[PDB]
Amino acid sequence: ELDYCRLTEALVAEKEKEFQDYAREVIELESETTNKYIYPLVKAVQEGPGGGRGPVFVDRGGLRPSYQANDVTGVQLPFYNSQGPKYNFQKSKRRLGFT
Amino acid sequence: MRECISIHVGQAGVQIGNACWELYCLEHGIQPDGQMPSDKTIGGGDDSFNTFFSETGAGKHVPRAVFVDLEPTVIDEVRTGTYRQLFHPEQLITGKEDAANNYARGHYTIGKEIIDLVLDRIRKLADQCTGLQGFLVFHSFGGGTGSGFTSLLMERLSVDYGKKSKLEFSIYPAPQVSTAVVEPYNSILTTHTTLEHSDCAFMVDNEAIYDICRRNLDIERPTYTNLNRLIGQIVSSITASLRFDGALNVDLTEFQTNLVPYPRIHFPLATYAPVISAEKAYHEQLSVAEITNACFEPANQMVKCDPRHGKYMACCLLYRGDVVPKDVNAAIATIKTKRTIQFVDWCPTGFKVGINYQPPTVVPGGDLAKVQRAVCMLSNTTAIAEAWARLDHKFDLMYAKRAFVHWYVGEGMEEGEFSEAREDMAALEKDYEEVGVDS
Amino acid sequence: MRECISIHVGQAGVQIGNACWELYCLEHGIQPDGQMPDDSFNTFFSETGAGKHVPRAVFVDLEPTVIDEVRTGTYRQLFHPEQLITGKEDAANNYARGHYTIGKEIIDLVLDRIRKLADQCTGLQGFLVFHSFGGGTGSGFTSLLMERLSVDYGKKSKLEFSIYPAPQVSTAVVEPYNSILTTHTTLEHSDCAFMVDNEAIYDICRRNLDIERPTYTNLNRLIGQIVSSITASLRFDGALNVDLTEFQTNLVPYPRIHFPLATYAPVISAEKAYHEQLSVAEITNACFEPANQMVKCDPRHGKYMACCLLYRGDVVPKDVNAAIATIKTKRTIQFVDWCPTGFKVGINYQPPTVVPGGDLAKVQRAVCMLSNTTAIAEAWARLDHKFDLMYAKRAFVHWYVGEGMEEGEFSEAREDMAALEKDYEEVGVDS
Amino acid sequence: MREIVHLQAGQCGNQIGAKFWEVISDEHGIDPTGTYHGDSDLQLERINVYYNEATGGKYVPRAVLVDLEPGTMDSVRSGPFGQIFRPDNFVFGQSGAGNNWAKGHYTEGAELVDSVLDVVRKEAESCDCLQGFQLTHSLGGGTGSGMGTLLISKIREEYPDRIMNTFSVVPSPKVSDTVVEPYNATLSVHQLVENTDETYCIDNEALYDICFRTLKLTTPTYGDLNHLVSATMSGVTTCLRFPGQLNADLRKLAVNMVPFPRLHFFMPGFAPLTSRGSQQYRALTVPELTQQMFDAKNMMAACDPRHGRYLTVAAVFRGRMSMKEVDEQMLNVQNKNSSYFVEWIPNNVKTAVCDIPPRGLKMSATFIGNSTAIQELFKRISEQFTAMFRRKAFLHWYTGEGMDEMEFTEAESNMNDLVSEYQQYQ
């Protein structure tokens, strides 16, 4: 069962890599003269797989899950960067005394 | 998703909407051309701009505000100035003849001509956004189109949109200086409209900002070009909880529930602190206690009234920057012990705070300094009845001798609106006095 | 396998046709000589063995000053010379002259040449006829052309583009006289008929297009883009297509009612298109605005009973049905109680193309709306009052009587039209 | 097998529930990806209580997340461990409440309650033998206190013979944050005392006192405060997930702490909370645990048991121990403080032990105590409620949304008789 799950993950990753190849080739062919109109192409390749705006889960393979639970509208959650400093859990535990 | 639409009425409205939207662009990095910086094409990009800026597939971010004024001279400087390519051409509505400091001309005759053209663009900006909390309104009391046109804008918008939020940022006339003569007539005759067709309303006094600039920021001869930066700093700190992440967020719906205890009492007062020049900011430390003390200081208050003579009704705190909530709770406690500040007896817990991580930004050529933390206070009290009593006395002695009335009665409106606004103001002042009386 | 024949009458129909065929050649990539520098052109361009393409349009007129510029200009070699029928003496804004005196001399030639064009087409899809209510050639000669065409061709669809006379401005004084005796002919000899007021396009080009000084060429470019969206499904495949027989059935509830209102959106300059994002939910709102119709009447006074939608370009059916839903929730627009689902939707993939030196800009999604509305009784009741005050003391009646028609046809058209005005009044009553 | 369904209501509930699922993930050894990276084998033999199995050997928390605004669902998705939670379990809404009990209970939470009930019923019917529910919410907020009591009343009707816990965040006198929080809280405890088995009072100024004085920290952020809260939430379900000499569940602690259904408010406390520098000086021994457990500095409710007296006391211990220490020490503190204990019932202490200590720790203890000193909190908020309501304060936000003033009057009387029968047992 574990072997099957790994095989399915590998197949999905191969399909995404083929799309990345095609997209990079098309953008490189289109940007020969000027780069003043490559913004929709760059935005489309930087959309991320799935309708999500959260950071990609790189250990999961770049998955971007979607969150649409709002009555009948179903608008996705926005994204905001945090100015708060990041913390290590071992540092937090040792500071709070669970050591 | 949490979009916010701005309504800027009058020459004051279109001038405050210039420095305010300049601060909005530099906060999100919007270039004056309209697009995001092209060098920042690195993967990511927070959706914190959709509350103020629209989206196009080209990458252009169009603001969602409308600029309305009956004077085409001051609107056309926007089409000539630096930001001629950012603003949409159809979002700036221009009249042909100004209201000329009058209520009747700006309300019944000339305001009816453009009451459809503006609201057509309002509908186009309202179906564009999915979830709209409400509209922000910038207008001045003393202006003709600020009083006359707004007094029909609020009534017809209340019918067009039922339970949307209505915040009001009003330029109140100063008690000593004055740029007009018939401004008591313009101020009194529209307070009946804003009594029943406004959810919340703040007030600013031009000479009260004048003393702040000359005493705190070490600028001897200020101009409206930096007063609008101070007002735009206030609106930015109010809405920054919606735009950016915080330890605990406050919405436009959230604070209007905590500052309006009665439908006839929706007049709190705004205060910003610290406002310190660059050469003075490097001397003093700016702690949480030393910025929340200036908000309670009546000298730093930007309305010509004293809460020491009055009594505090409710308070709202907007903290922005490197702030820890432990020091906020400590500073709140040490204010509560001092008997110089007096609270009403039936509101023992009269505080509500909000925390924001991002420090405020500055503009090139600005007079404020780069600070690590700042606070905006929205405090309600009874001390506005002092300002109401010192203005309606001047209104009563103006109207005793039937002065300037022929500039109103011949334009279409009757004369009984003067007496009914006189009687409504007397009931409002009686209402504020009865609430201030404790059991 | 599908073929359409274009019929242009009058000076307005010729000038519209030149602007239309400029758009058509640039859309299909046709040089003005007629040869390309894969088979979508078969409905409009006949095929020659040398590689040339000949249009299937007949330009007719009764004054040589309009056809002469066609035979002289850039497309002098593209058009077949037998397709440009030219008379000798024009009717000169007289319906009676164009119906009873002048039109019978060339009615043999135009009916012969329409047979040669119909011979080459294996299956006829529809006759497009461009005509004007005002001028004599577009009123008189057009009237007995359909009376001959109704018995010559049985059930073949004959779609119509009328030039409805303007309510407040005018080219002619006798243009209400012309625009009434043709309504009798177009009741029983027209399948579908769209209409236009000139100053409405004048208002659109002045306000939306930032053109303070337009010409008839600038109007004819906007008219041609309205024409192209109808035939776009005929010439290009889409997610779901619409044919000429398709939308003509779903918009007429009775044979006496075949007068809908077209409305194009978005109309915008290349300056404002850089500012505004044009989504399908944002372009469908402009089809309901009282300031943005091409017709000078407000549908808020009336009520809708049939609507047709023509979406072209990068469009998604989910956002179409989402935008249709939220318009139905709005209570400003009203529908009749006897037609709960009055919508018809057409989808095309190709974005609309633009000509150099034109007014509009390249757009990625556009919409054309074909809505039947009770409010055309508003404009007719305005024009009915103008007709009978002119006819109260018999103005200009000596000109029409002396041509050969009897004096009873004026009152015959009045008692006809009063019944049709009563007809539209009782359609809109609720059950 | 007995499982716990976790409820997260409100922004406060989400920020303490994220840290709760943070802590027990390290207790069971769960990576941010979702797999298992541990050392022993006992960490996998009881994992079905908090985690549901998935494909590829993945475990997901058995929790649902409830809030009315999208502001805080982003932070529980962009956090360090936000990627473990199920994407379908997030239940948010277009319009928030904004510190309003009335909007949260009647006009905004009445539509979202259909969706979250569908989610929780779909998950709970998939359980083999469900043990009980657990709720985290705050009384000072619009969404956690408004429809959170609506969630309590709905699933009490739907699942009668069950147990539910709540970790309620009551407001503080000096760390008051909402102006209308007496309205948000008194109307909540009227709907809370009727249909709740177990209630833990967690007050913010109690956590501020522990972080400032005992732990000697300078910047106690909310990430630090939720760790103290999650130490007790992990500290109450230790014997259910780990075998011990004397196991105890939530129900076993329930039947020993409540003698009557209207006496169910408690005082959580955690025994090892020495500061970072003082750690090397203090021996970790059983009398050291039980000394700090009964200290009034370690109480997480803003009342002193000296002014009242303890009714029932629960003790849950962690770590391999010899219990001849834990019986002689609890008998010593029962005999010495005779005036602080009721005399109409003897042997007022329930003792429980667990073999497995928390990670990085050798010995631990958790306190759940019922007393009469909770009335000091109830009288303190009732006097502010009475001093506010009598002049019709802020009432147009409340009486204009459907409810009448008789709901205020009956919330006065039900809370007054509740503290009256608290005094009757004192």
Ligand SMILES: Nc1nc2c(ncn2[C@@H]2O[C@H](COP(=O)(O)OP(=O)(O)OP(=O)(O)O)[C@@H](O)[C@H]2O)c(=O)[nH]1
């Ligand atoms: N604080 C502040 N007030 C301003 C500013 N600009 C104009 N005002 C106020 O506007 C008042 C005068 O009315 P205006 O806004 O200039 O003109 P108006 O609204 O078009 O009305 P009319 O004079 O009748 O045309 C003055 O009393 C000022 O208080 C500004 O930049 N900052």
Ligand SMILES: Nc1nc2c(ncn2[C@@H]2O[C@H](COP(=O)(O)OP(=O)(O)OP(=O)(O)O)[C@@H](O)[C@H]2O)c(=O)[nH]1
């Ligand atoms: N909408 C529109 N109408 C036009 C245009 N050009 C002419 N017309 C209409 O045509 C009417 C007059 O007829 P003309 O086009 O000049 O020529 P005609 O139809 O052949 O009539 P005669 O000159 O009498 O033979 C006017 O009332 C206009 O309304 C145009 O470019 N657009």
Ligand SMILES: Nc1nc2c(ncn2[C@@H]2O[C@H](COP(=O)(O)OP(=O)(O)O)[C@@H](O)[C@H]2O)c(=O)[nH]1
């Ligand atoms: N202990 C603790 N209290 C919190 C935390 N976050 C917020 N609070 C408290 O909860 C109150 C705000 O709750 P609120 O967001 O309005 O609840 P909601 O309306 O249900 O979302 C504040 O007074 C805070 O003191 C936290 O992480 N830990």
Ligand SMILES: [Mg+2]
């Ligand atoms: Mg003006």
Ligand SMILES: [Mg+2]
């Ligand atoms: Mg002609």
